[PDB]
């Protein structure tokens, strides 16, 4: 199917002492493959997937230099934003940035993105055209005018349509054994009495990859949302994901209810029904 490469950066200021805490993580689809944490001992970009460990010393030197340059940009930005928003040096503030590219089934460029937030709110983002900026407020409008004069969107578009997708395709090839393998959900249903006349049916989807999934309950072949609970998709901790959906039903009526599972690793959606 379609694939993506995405980098996430967070910097948090430390008003009491020192410089910001900086954390950067890189992903291919839902697989973390690199990380940098300013609080860690190495002070290097570190591998988190076996297929990236293949890369030579010049790759690791280059990624370490670039990620420390991103850390310095965020540190300077934290100071700039304090002034733009007329804030004191006393509070802790946060800057977040995410950028990356998507490729279609044919591994050709589909879309690029580059966005930035200050204190958890949109600040400035590159539009879908990769030519224009969306500034959320007047402080960001000042940044937009500066970047419109410094060829910033041009440089970002060249990276997103070129380097980003070329390296994504290299990673997809090198890590083929895991990155191009789909792990269909292992599904089962559990039953938990809630009284002597009602029970919860819980439909589980375990150990699946990628994280995108749909779990839906039906009653007598029509969608049911009343008395249902769906948890947010959560990491198993081993690189796969989990989810469940539950419904409270009258005891003895379990056969009317079906759980429907849709996932990229399944040729056709799965249907589960409680079997006593």
């Amino acid at each position: 199917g379609s694939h993506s490469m995405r980098y996430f950066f967070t910097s948090v200021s430390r008003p009491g002492r020192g410089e910001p805490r900086f954390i950067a993580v890189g992903y291919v689809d839902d697989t973390q493959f690199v990380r940098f944490d300013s609080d860690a001992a190495s002070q290097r970009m570190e591998p988190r997937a076996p297929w990236i460990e293949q890369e030579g010393p010049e790759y690791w030197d280059g990624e370490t230099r670039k990620v420390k340059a991103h850390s310095q940009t965020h540190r300077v930005d934290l100071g700039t934003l304090r002034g733009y928003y007329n804030q004191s040096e006393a509070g802790s503030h946060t800057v977040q940035r995410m950028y990356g590219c998507d490729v279609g089934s044919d591994w050709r460029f589909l879309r690029g993105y580059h966005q930035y937030a200050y204190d958890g709110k949109d600040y400035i983002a590159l539009k879908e055209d990769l030519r224009s900026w969306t500034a959320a407020d007047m402080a960001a409008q000042t940044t937009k005018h500066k970047w419109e004069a410094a060829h910033v969107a041009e440089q970002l578009r060249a990276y997103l349509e070129g380097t980003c997708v070329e390296w994504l395709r290299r990673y997809l090839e090198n890590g083929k054994e895991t990155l191009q393998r789909t792990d269909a959900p292992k599904t089962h249903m559990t039953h938990h009495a809630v009284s002597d006349h009602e029970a919860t049916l819980r439909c589980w989807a375990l150990s699946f990859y990628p994280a995108e999934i749909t779990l839906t309950w039906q009653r007598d072949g029509e969608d049911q949302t009343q008395d249902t609970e769906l948890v947010e998709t959560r990491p198993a901790g081993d690189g796969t994901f989990q989810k469940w959906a539950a419904v409270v039903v009258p005891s003895g009526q379990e056969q009317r209810y079906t759980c429907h599972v849709q996932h990229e690793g399944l040729p056709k959606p799965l249907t589960l029904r409680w079997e006593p």
Binding site: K66, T73, D77, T80, W147, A150, V152, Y159, W167
Partner: peptide, 9 residues
């Protein structure tokens, strides 16, 4: 592979 553009706000 990270971008090499490091432009400040």
């Amino acid at each position: 592979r990270l971008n090499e553009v490091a432009n400040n706000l």
